[PDB]
Amino acid sequence: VTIGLAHAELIAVVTAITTDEPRVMTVREGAALPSGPFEFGHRTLQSGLREWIHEQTHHPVGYLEQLYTFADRDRGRTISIGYLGLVREQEWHGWYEYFPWEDHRQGRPDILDSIIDKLRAWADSEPDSRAQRHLRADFTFGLDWNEELTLQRYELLYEAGLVGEAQSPRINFGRPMFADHRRILATGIARLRAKIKYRPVVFELMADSFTLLQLQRAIEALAGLTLHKQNFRRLIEQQQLVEETGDMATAKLFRFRQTVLDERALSGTKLPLSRN
Amino acid sequence: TIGLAHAELIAVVTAITTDEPRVMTVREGAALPSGPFEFGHRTLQSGLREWIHEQTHHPVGYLEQLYTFADRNEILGGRTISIGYLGLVREQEAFWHGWYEYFPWEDHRQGRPDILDSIIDKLRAWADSEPDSRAQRHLRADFTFGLDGGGWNEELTLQRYELLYEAGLVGEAQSEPRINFGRPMFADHRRILATGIARLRAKIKYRPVVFELMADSFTLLQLQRAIEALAGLTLHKQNFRRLIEQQQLVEETGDMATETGGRPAKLFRFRQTVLDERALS
Numbered sequence: 001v002t003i004g005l006a007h008a009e010l011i012a013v014v015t016a017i018t019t020d021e022p023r024v025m026t027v028r029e030g031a032a033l034p035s036g037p038f039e040f041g042h043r044t045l046q047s048g049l050r051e052w053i054h055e056q057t058h059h060p061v062g063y064l065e066q067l068y069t070f071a072d073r074d075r076g077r078t079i080s081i082g083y084l085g086l087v088r089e090q091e092w093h094g095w096y097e098y099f100p101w102e103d104h105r106q107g108r109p110d111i112l113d114s115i116i117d118k119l120r121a122w123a124d125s126e127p128d129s130r131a132q133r134h135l136r137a138d139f140t141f142g143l144d145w146n147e148e149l150t151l152q153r154y155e156l157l158y159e160a161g162l163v164g165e166a167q168s169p170r171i172n173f174g175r176p177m178f179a180d181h182r183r184i185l186a187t188g189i190a191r192l193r194a195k196i197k198y199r200p201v202v203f204e205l206m207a208d209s210f211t212l213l214q215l216q217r218a219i220e221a222l223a224g225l226t227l228h229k230q231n232f233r234r235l236i237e238q239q240q241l242v243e244e245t246g247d248m249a250t251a252k253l254f255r256f257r258q259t260v261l262d263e264r265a266l267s268g269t270k271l272p273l274s275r276n
Numbered sequence: 277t278i279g280l281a282h283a284e285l286i287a288v289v290t291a292i293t294t295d296e297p298r299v300m301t302v303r304e305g306a307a308l309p310s311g312p313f314e315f316g317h318r319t320l321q322s323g324l325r326e327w328i329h330e331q332t333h334h335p336v337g338y339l340e341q342l343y344t345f346a347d348r349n350e351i352l353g354g355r356t357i358s359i360g361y362l363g364l365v366r367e368q369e370a371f372w373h374g375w376y377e378y379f380p381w382e383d384h385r386q387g388r389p390d391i392l393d394s395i396i397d398k399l400r401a402w403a404d405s406e407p408d409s410r411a412q413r414h415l416r417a418d419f420t421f422g423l424d425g426g427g428w429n430e431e432l433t434l435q436r437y438e439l440l441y442e443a444g445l446v447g448e449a450q451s452e453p454r455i456n457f458g459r460p461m462f463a464d465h466r467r468i469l470a471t472g473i474a475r476l477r478a479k480i481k482y483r484p485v486v487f488e489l490m491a492d493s494f495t496l497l498q499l500q501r502a503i504e505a506l507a508g509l510t511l512h513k514q515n516f517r518r519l520i521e522q523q524q525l526v527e528e529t530g531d532m533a534t535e536t537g538g539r540p541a542k543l544f545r546f547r548q549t550v551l552d553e554r555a556l557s
Contacts, residue, residue: 003282003352005280005353006283006313007280007281008280008355037278038346039278040350043348044346045346045357066344069320069341069344070320071317071319071320076315079313079357081344135556149557152557266420266435267435270343270434272432272475273478274478274483276341
């Protein structure tokens with residue numbers, strides 16, 4: 001019996017919100033996410049990654065949930081397993097340093113004009129696949145916007161040679177990362193934006209007490225969008241996520257109900273998930 | 277060398293036939309189609325497609341990754357990990373078996389199954405065996421199997437299987453006296469199948485894009501029966517038809533079908549935009 005082996009890497013996407021900016025735990029002066037191999041001594045994948053987070057950041061981490069597993073795109077093999085965690089910063093680079101085209105809180109960023117042009121030049125480069133490439137680019141990058149399609153946009157940029165990690169005449173948008181860590185980060189961004197669009201269980205990102213304005217501003221920071229104010233508030237009351245603390249702030253203060261906190265405690269790292 | 281692993285790619289390919297959810301198997305229903313990730317595989321997904329073809333020769337459409345599990349043995353030189361994928365297809369002339377042969381406690385279409393009486397009894401005796409763990413084990417048992425007043429949650433298939441495994445109530449755990457519910461599978465394949473069922477149930481509750489399971493044209497009753505089979509629950513007819521209309525998932529084809537009693541019903545199809553979105557993802 002011949003057994004094929006490959007490098008098994010655990011990669012952490014730990015996100016915090018400070019000053020209404022989504023930050024991500026990084027290492028090596030922001031060039032990479034916390035990561036490390038999966039070793040014999042590790043009980044689980046999660047516990048092995050928590051060892052690397054501790055050694056490399058010494059920052060506490062709460063619940064973790066598995067993101068996605070990727071084979072390498074080099075040219076032995078490497079298999080990368082990503083995890084998502086939400087924390088409050090203790091004692092950090094921003095998402096949009098790496099994905100500047102994903103923050104539409106102040107309208108479409110002008111960088112998208114450069115991105116779309118180079119993207120359509122690529123789409124027009126081969127006639128037999130021009131129509132399909134225009135459809136993909138039109139669907140992913142805006143419409144003829146969907147904040148959940150963060151991974152599909154980065155995959156298309158990579159296929160089009162428009163990020164440094166593709167290593168094509170080097171064209172690049174946003175800060176590149178070591179190996180395919182920016183691919184992992186795009187997966188964590190997409191997962192968090194799908195989570196908050198329908199049930200924003202983000203008590204780990206908030207202080208115990210918060211106003212509905214602050215809760216909206218932090219969701220808006222994660223989504224990279226401005227949300228209809230009254231639509232967000234009725235979505236919150238619909239999902240029965242928060243309750244008022246009885247105290248005030250200068251606006252009412254709220255906190256996530258204990259039923260929300262306990263259900264997370266009995267769920268694990270593989271949540272019943274809507275889709276990719 | 278530190279950090280090496282061997283990866284098995286495991287397929288959960290589901291169809292609906294005679295209003296029963298069915299999974300593609302090999303070895304007469306004992307295992308899912310699976311195979312190792314090899315150096316020449318461009319991606320994990322394309323590797324699994326080669327194993328599905330060699331082992332079943334059944335066509336497969338879209339696939340989505342499920343979850344990656346690790347074992348629990350250092351003579352192998354690395355850990356072993358399992359990567360599952362979920363696909364939806366129409367069944368063709370590979371051995372197909374029903375989901376609920378392996379997970380009979382997950383089908384509540386005709387009421388709560390009687391097997392759950394024996395499962396909960398065995399689960400309570402295990403939770404009471406160790407007093408220092410009694411409280412935490414009971415909370416997990418009531419949450420997973422819906423005894424906590426919140427009701428049955430059809431999405432928690434994986435959390436229920438893992439608790440049964442931790443309690444040694446499935447044959448794959450190999451307990452001191454053997455206790456097993458449902459038909460076991462090779463290796464950890466039921467853990468993968470439970471992940472695929474849970475993922476599919478989370479999809480249909482939110483947005484039932486299951487055009488790969490239906491024929492090209494279908495009635496609304498046929499679509500409802502398909503969703504009910506996946507969920508293991510009977511649907512609220514009006515809420516269901518309200519859901520797919522607000523999602524704008526289907527459209528009238530213009531043709532009519534004649535149900536078995538003679539009642540005419542309009543045929544429907546999933547809209548082309550729905551097909552296009554899934555392609556461009």
